[model samples]
Target: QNNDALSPAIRRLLAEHNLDASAIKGTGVGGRLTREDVEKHLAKA
Candidate 1:
């Protein structure tokens, strides 16, 4: 269900970093992760 919930682009980006879809808290509609969210997560890491 988590994989299906992610956008294709976001999913692909996370894959490259060996990160999972559930790693970030999405602020978009329906709690969907956005590019900004991913970037913030990377910064914290």
Candidate 2:
């Protein structure tokens, strides 16, 4: 997954949460994910 496809908010959240962007799974276009993606992942947790 490409990190560039992620939204700034999501990227920041991941940093705040101490989650490595390189670790989270991306489902956005071209395997990229955004803040919504992180939210979705969080919702499941």
Candidate 3:
């Protein structure tokens, strides 16, 4: 994910949710998130 695309709040939310960027199957350009990766990481939970 393009960390720049996400706001600080959203980035924090991902961390709070324990969603690792490496684990997500990114669908954005070059396998990156143009926006915040909101997909819930239930596997981590």
Clashes of each: 0, 0, 0
Q: List the pairs of residues colliding in candidate 2.
A: none
After superposing candidate 3 on the true structure, give the runs of residues whose Cα lies further than 4 Å from its correct spot. Answer: 1-10, 34-37, 43-45
TM-score of each: 0.80, 0.59, 0.42
- The stretch of ten residues in a row with the least summed lDDT in candidate 2 is 1-10
lDDT of every predicted structure (CA atoms)? 0.81, 0.70, 0.52
Q: Compare candidates 1 and 3 on TM-score and give the better one.
A: 1
Considering TM-score, which of the candidate structures 1 and 2 is the better prediction for this target? 1
Q: Write down the lDDT that model 1 would get.
A: 0.81
Candidate 2 per-residue lDDT over residues 1-45, each given as its tens digit: 344766677778987776655666777777776676676667675
Which model, 2 or 3, shows the larger TM-score? 2
Estimate candidate 3's alpha-carbon lDDT, on a 0 to 1 scale: 0.52
Regions of candidate 1 where Cα sits further than 4 Å from its true position: 1-4
lDDT string for model 3 (1-45, tens) is: 343444455466678776655655545555654233555454434
